[PDB]
Amino acid sequence: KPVLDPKRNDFQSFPLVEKTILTHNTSMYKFGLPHADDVLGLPIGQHIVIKANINGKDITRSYTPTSLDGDTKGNFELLVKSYPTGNVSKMIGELKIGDSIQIKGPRGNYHYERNCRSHLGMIAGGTGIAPMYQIMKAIAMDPHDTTKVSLVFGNVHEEDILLKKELEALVAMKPSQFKIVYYLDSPDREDWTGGVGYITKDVIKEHLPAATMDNVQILICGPPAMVASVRRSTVDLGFRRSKPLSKMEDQVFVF
Ligand SMILES: Cc1cc2nc3c(=O)[nH]c(=O)nc-3n(C[C@H](O)[C@H](O)[C@H](O)COP(=O)(O)OP(=O)(O)OC[C@H]3O[C@@H](n4cnc5c(N)ncnc54)[C@H](O)[C@@H]3O)c2cc1C
Numbered sequence: 182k183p184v185l186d187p188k189r190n191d192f193q194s195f196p197l198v199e200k201t202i203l204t205h206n207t208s209m210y211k212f213g214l215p216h217a218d219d220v221l222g223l224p225i226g227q228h229i230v231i232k233a234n235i236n237g238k239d240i241t242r243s244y245t246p247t248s249l250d251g252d253t254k255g256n257f258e259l260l261v262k263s264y265p266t267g268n269v270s271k272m273i274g275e276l277k278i279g280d281s282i283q284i285k286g287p288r289g290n291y292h293y294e295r296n297c298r299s300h301l302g303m304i305a306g307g308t309g310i311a312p313m314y315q316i317m318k319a320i321a322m323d324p325h326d327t328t329k330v331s332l333v334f335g336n337v338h339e340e341d342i343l344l345k346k347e348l349e350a351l352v353a354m355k356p357s358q359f360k361i362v363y364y365l366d367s368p369d370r371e372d373w374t375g376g377v378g379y380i381t382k383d384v385i386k387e388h389l390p391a392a393t394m395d396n397v398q399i400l401i402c403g404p405p406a407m408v409a410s411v412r413r414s415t416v417d418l419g420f421r422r423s424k425p426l427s428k429m430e431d432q433v434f435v436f
């Protein structure tokens with residue numbers, strides 16, 4: 182029984198049942214569903230939206246749960262990074278156990294289907310890993326999905342990297358299908374051995390599939406400066422220009 186239903190296109194309330202810290206500003210949040218056998222019902226590629234009433238406004242933002250129907254019943258799980266002057270993210274970071282959130286879904290133009298592409302090149306920064314992780318996890322857990330995934334995941338320093346151990350476990354499931362490189366612009370520590378710097382044209386050319394590969398797609402999600410930089414790099418590398426309104430058929434798709 183899926184809780185999200187496009188025919189009942191309204192907000193619904195779900196209570197916070199568990200909260201686990203990932204970093205000083207980021208936690209995993211587990212929200213309860215009405216029945217122990219319920220699943221969220223979120224198609225792969227799509228997100229939920231969460232509404233907070235703040236400063237006289239209904240403010241809504243997109244979140245991609247880390248849980249899938251196939252591994253999570255009776256609840257759903259989100260990763261949320263809170264900012265000091267955030268809005269919806271600040272509300273979430275103020276919830277106590279038992280408080281509820283108002284959500285609506287599913288939403289989004291990315292409708293992932295098994296083997297719809299031969300190779301996904303993923304470019305993520307910060308919480309932009311969330312839409313990527315959902316897709317890679319689905320592909321990892323589907324024993325008939327052969328889609329190659331090459332992810333370049335850029336952050337400023339070590340404490341900003343999210344889901345690294347989870348991602349590495351997905352690689353270990355399909356080590357011939359999945360490739361991840363981590364970049365840090367400015368590592369804090371001398372024991373970083375991943376990539377150094379930000380995601381440049383040269384990084385994308387080295388690590389992601391080329392624009393000439395049949396049925397390839399580039400997926401992008403991150404803060405606006407990263408998105409503008411990497412979009413320009415993909416055009417310079419011969420990918421088709423991402424469309425103002427990203428649609429699933431586009432060669433470069435921005436979340
Ligand atoms: C498809 C999609 C999936 C997403 N999934 C997730 C997810 O699973 N988890 C998650 O935590 N977020 C996710 N995001 C990001 C999320 O939608 C919000 O942008 C984020 O939570 C900030 O919302 P806000 O209302 O708190 O801040 P806003 O109202 O957007 O901004 C208010 C202030 O907060 C600060 N701020 C906001 N965003 C940033 C930022 N990126 N870096 C630095 N400061 C910032 C700035 O000071 C800004 O002025 C996703 C976004 C998309 C498009």
Ligand SMILES: [Cl-]
Nearest residue numbers: 190191192285
């Ligand atoms: Cl609506």
Ligand SMILES: [Cl-]
Nearest residue numbers: 230243288289
């Ligand atoms: Cl939306």
Ligand SMILES: [Cl-]
Nearest residue numbers: 421430431432
């Ligand atoms: Cl296109």
